[PDB]
Design an enzyme around this catalytic site. Structure first.
Site, PDB file in Angstrom:
ATOM      1  N   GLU A   1     -31.066   0.816 -43.941  1.00 11.94           N
ATOM      2  CA  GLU A   1     -29.922   1.666 -43.619  1.00 11.94           C
ATOM      3  C   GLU A   1     -30.285   2.770 -42.628  1.00 11.94           C
ATOM      4  OE1 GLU A   1     -26.536   1.762 -44.790  1.00 11.94           O
ATOM      5  OE2 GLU A   1     -27.020  -0.324 -45.255  1.00 11.94           O
TER       6      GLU A   1
ATOM      7  N   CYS B   1     -22.996  -9.450 -51.116  1.00 10.37           N
ATOM      8  CA  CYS B   1     -23.819  -8.464 -51.791  1.00 10.37           C
ATOM      9  C   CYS B   1     -24.218  -9.025 -53.152  1.00 10.37           C
ATOM     10  CB  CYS B   1     -23.002  -7.175 -51.951  1.00 10.37           C
ATOM     11  SG  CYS B   1     -23.767  -5.861 -52.922  1.00 10.37           S
TER      12      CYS B   1
ATOM     13  N   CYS C   1     -31.328  -9.590 -52.067  1.00 11.03           N
ATOM     14  CA  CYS C   1     -30.560  -8.427 -51.643  1.00 11.03           C
ATOM     15  C   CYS C   1     -30.222  -8.743 -50.195  1.00 11.03           C
ATOM     16  CB  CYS C   1     -31.400  -7.151 -51.702  1.00 11.03           C
ATOM     17  SG  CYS C   1     -30.584  -5.731 -50.934  1.00 11.03           S
TER      18      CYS C   1
ATOM     19  N   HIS D   1     -29.722  -6.962 -47.769  1.00  6.68           N
ATOM     20  CA  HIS D   1     -30.374  -6.083 -46.792  1.00  6.68           C
ATOM     21  C   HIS D   1     -31.778  -6.611 -46.451  1.00  6.68           C
ATOM     22  CE1 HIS D   1     -27.341  -3.117 -47.972  1.00  6.68           C
ATOM     23  NE2 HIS D   1     -27.743  -2.345 -46.976  1.00  6.68           N
TER      24      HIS D   1
ATOM     25  N   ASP E   1     -19.800  -5.559 -48.536  1.00  7.91           N
ATOM     26  CA  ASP E   1     -21.157  -5.207 -48.921  1.00  7.91           C
ATOM     27  C   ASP E   1     -21.244  -3.693 -48.944  1.00  7.91           C
ATOM     28  OD1 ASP E   1     -24.279  -4.788 -47.347  1.00  7.91           O
ATOM     29  OD2 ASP E   1     -24.010  -5.560 -49.376  1.00  7.91           O
TER      30      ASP E   1
HETATM   31  N1  LIG Z   1     -26.904  -5.332 -50.084  1.00 11.51           N
HETATM   32  C1  LIG Z   1     -26.473  -5.423 -51.486  1.00 11.51           C
HETATM   33  C2  LIG Z   1     -26.556  -4.034 -52.207  1.00 11.51           C
HETATM   34  C3  LIG Z   1     -27.753  -3.170 -51.766  1.00 11.51           C
HETATM   35  C4  LIG Z   1     -27.553  -1.741 -52.260  1.00 11.51           C
HETATM   36  O1  LIG Z   1     -26.508  -1.151 -52.035  1.00 11.51           O
HETATM   37  O2  LIG Z   1     -28.431  -1.174 -52.885  1.00 11.51           O
HETATM   38  C5  LIG Z   1     -27.275  -6.474 -52.248  1.00 11.51           C
HETATM   39  O3  LIG Z   1     -27.326  -7.659 -51.810  1.00 11.51           O
HETATM   40  O4  LIG Z   1     -27.879  -6.188 -53.326  1.00 11.51           O
END
Ligand SMILES: N[C@H](CCC(=O)O)C(=O)O
Ligand SMILES: N[C@H](CCC(=O)O)C(=O)O
Ligand SMILES: [Ca+2]
Ligand SMILES: [Ca+2]
Lengths: 267, 267
Positions: B152, B73, B184, B186, B10
């Site tokens: 982050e 990701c 996402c 995150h 990721d």
């Molecule tokens: N965490 C990844 C990428 C987030 C990023 O780097 O902007 C996702 O699922 O999209």
């Protein structure tokens, strides 16, 4: 390609328990079913013979250009899955592991039973699978050779079946199992009887039905799902035995009026 | 080998939402994680660049003998899954389809929303996936560029996060959505805030978490599941950014005190 059918094979009407659940979860997938009724039961047959017969059925459907093969038969999955999967370019799905994963998740007292043909029990496939996941679980395995015949004779709701199930499963009554795997795709047709005999506190695991969930994910993983609309060709049902007898069971079990099957030859 | 680790990649800490669920469902699988923190966010980067970086991460873990690669990701799954999967000898798992299958099953009014990076939304991966299953479902997509930075920076529980999520998600208000895909990895770190902004009536779909179920069945399909015992080597965490910053978030999110990460270089 993605529009081709998913093929399902079994010794008879057993595989229908996988197909019925597939009609529910995957209504837009075209299916082609083949039950080797003429040679049923596979249960007491030698492993190498079941492998031979399984390949014959697989070859019959490969000719029909199936995009995925489901061995909707525990007896055949136990002895032929690995070999067929390794040989074919298309996904090959067995029904044992999906049932094993499900049982392991539902058990609370770690007492899981498993009923199946002499062949499935002889292979110890379920015992091995459950141990590979959770060794602490106590697995009780029992072969029930009298179950398939009463399903195939279309008497799975008769008094004859209730007596057979009660007598056979007596061997499990004093174990205190809270989970019982229906390790033979023919057994879900006897589910109401088996449930009554085991008691309302025992969770029954339909291995064939549990497999559809895997099939669904595999269609995405291998990116071979049918378009999201009814197939332009109907499902097809084949049997090496009487089409008439097959249609009477299938029509009633699947709830499909006037379902028609074709008698074909394997050999 | 069945004893090798499952690798997860990721852009940063987002993949931890897949890993956390893996620690729950697959206690006996050894895991190796890599978050490309130094180049995070991947969200606004051109597809070809994300493909490049994703390959570098995959390559980094392949060098550690992983038996399976999970692209935890959505941004990377959207543009590199197909290519990486066709090229590697090991299973490659994306997080988009599992999330789409889950969303489709939970919606009642057939109004599903999806939030993700500019890249994920630009690829329309979710819209296409959901339409490939149930075209009747109305999909509402929305990019949330401000979300990843606050996760982050370890501010996902702060007051500033509440403001940003509410302001950003205002676009989804009164759209009649009963389901929202956290597209996402995150985003689940912002779940309670997202849930509060959307209603308690909206079912949130954690795609990363949903993927673990698929990983579990894939281990069985490919027959490469770890033995049912705690691995003899601990999990490993890598980041191209500050180890200290990564451990601060990771240890808190996973509830693993003193978790340690290694800062490495990619290029
Ligand atoms: N965490 C990844 C990428 C987030 C990023 O780097 O902007 C996702 O699922 O999209
Ligand atoms: N229905 C197959 C085989 C039954 C038989 O032919 O004996 C099974 O699940 O075991
Ligand atoms: Ca038998
Ligand atoms: Ca973005």
């Amino acid at each position: 390609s993605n529009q081709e059918a998913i093929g399902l094979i079994d010794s008879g009407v057993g595989g229908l328990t996988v197909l019925k659940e597939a009609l529910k979860q995957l209504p837009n997938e075209r299916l082609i079913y083949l039950g080797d009724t003429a040679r049923c039961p596979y249960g007491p047959r030698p492993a190498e013979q079941v492998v031979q017969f399984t390949w014959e059925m697989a070859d019959f459907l490969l000719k029909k250009r199936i995009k995925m093969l489901v061995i909707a038969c525990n007896t055949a999955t136990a002895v032929a899955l690995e070999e067929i999967k390794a040989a074919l370019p298309i996904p090959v799905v067995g029904v044992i592991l999906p049932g094993a994963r499900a049982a392991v998740k539902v058990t609370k007292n770690n007492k899981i039973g498993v009923i199946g043909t002499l062949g499935t029990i002889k292979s110890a496939s379920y015992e091995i699978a459950i141990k590979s996941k959770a060794p602490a679980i106590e697995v009780t395995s029992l072969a029930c050779p009298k179950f398939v015949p009463i399903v195939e004779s279309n008497q799975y709701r008769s008094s004859v079946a209730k007596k057979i199930v009660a007598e056979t499963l007596q061997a499990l009554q004093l174990k205190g199992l809270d989970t019982l795997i229906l390790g033979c795709t023919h057994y879900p047709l006897l589910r109401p009887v088996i449930q009554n005999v085991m008691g309302s506190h025992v969770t029954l695991i339909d291995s064939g039905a549990e497999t559809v969930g895997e099939v669904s994910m595999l269609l995405d993983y291998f990116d071979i799902a049918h378009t999201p609309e009814a197939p332009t060709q109907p499902h097809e049902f084949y049997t090496t035995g009487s089409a008439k007898m097959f249609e009477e069971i299938a029509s009633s079990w699947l709830g499909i009026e006037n379902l028609k099957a074709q008698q074909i030859h394997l050999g």
